[PDB]
Design a protein around this nucleic acid. Structure first.
Lengths: 50, 127, 127
RNA sequence: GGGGCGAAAUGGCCUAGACCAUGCCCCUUGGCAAACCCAUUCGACCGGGUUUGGGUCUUCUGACCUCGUAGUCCGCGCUCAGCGGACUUCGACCA
């Protein structure tokens, strides 16, 4: 979570202190993961011995 | 610490060691307001392949102003800043007599009236 | 500043602290020519995750030569350089008696006549 | 609605590889703490509305109360108050 305010140029209240007009936020989530892959080749054979 | 007494003619000023370090010695004058006073920076090092040496001496003094005597609110504010640095490149294997003669010549050139006029009236040195 | 007196047998040498710093202490011997003299570098630090410590002690001394006694013109010039560093890796949680015994054994091995012969005659230690 | 993923649960492809189907991960922001008002057994009764909430001097730049955040030398002494104290910085309705 985070938060950052927003202030504009000399405006509102006929002031000039760069006052804050609003705020913008961002909510999220972080995650970690791991994985493994396996590859195998096999040769097959047959026979009708008699 | 380390105290240095300087005679201006009628009064004596005292500078106190503040930042005791080998590569940077900072002396500060203690009279009243510590901010915007007299400061001195000294540095000593070597050069190249242990041939000669290098000495640096800088002296700064910034004037301050205040309006609390008449105006009803003004903190002591600095005005201008003066920088007077130096550079000494004297080799170790030299000559004591030559170094003494050079120091005497530098002292004479400093105490002469030509540099004082060059500083005050901003007239180029040439009398 | 910090003075160290070393007794050679008939004369006493004085080493003066010059570069006072925590991670590097530089002691220099003051006898005559400052360039090409006796210098000592000391360092103390930690290691890993606050386990033990590390102490380094190096001693250097470069010989100088001069020809101004006979030849017209020759500045003092350094000849060779000798480096003798050390390394102390002693853990904090140890034993005072064991440390004292180790120091006594090191002192005995230094003061013995075998290391002196190994240094002088370059004969391998084995008597 | 806007995004994410092929990971992770399996199915096509399925030395390998990269894509697919259902399929699974989030947002629908939230909180102010005080003071006052109604009709009545002509207050006891829950619910609503208004004024304030770090604050002033020229809250224009910039400073004067306060603190929070750091970096730097720091005192092992000089000053009537004393003291442990210095300088530079960013923030200040709350998660």
């Amino acid at each position: 979570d985070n938060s950052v305010d927003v202030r504009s140029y000399p405006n509102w209240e006929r002031a000039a202190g760069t006052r804050i007009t609003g705020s913008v936020r961002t909510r999220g989530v972080v995650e970690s993961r791991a994985s493994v892959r396996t590859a195998l080749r096999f040769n097959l054979e047959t026979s009708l011995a008699g | 610490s380390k105290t240095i007494v300087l005679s201006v003619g009628e009064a004596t000023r005292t500078l106190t060691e503040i930042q005791s370090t080998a590569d940077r010695q900072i002396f500060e004058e203690k009279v009243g307001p510590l901010v915007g006073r007299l400061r001195l920076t000294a540095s000593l090092r070597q050069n190249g392949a242990k041939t000669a040496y290098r000495v640096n001496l800088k002296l700064d003094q910034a004037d301050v102003v205040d309006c609390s005597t008449s105006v009803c609110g003004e903190l002591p504010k600095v005005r201008y800043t003066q920088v007077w640095s130096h550079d000494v490149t004297i080799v170790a294997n030299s000559t004591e007599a030559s170094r003494k003669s050079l120091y005497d010549l530098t002292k004479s050139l400093v105490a002469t009236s030509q540099v004082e006029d060059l500083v005050v009236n901003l007239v180029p040195l040439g009398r």
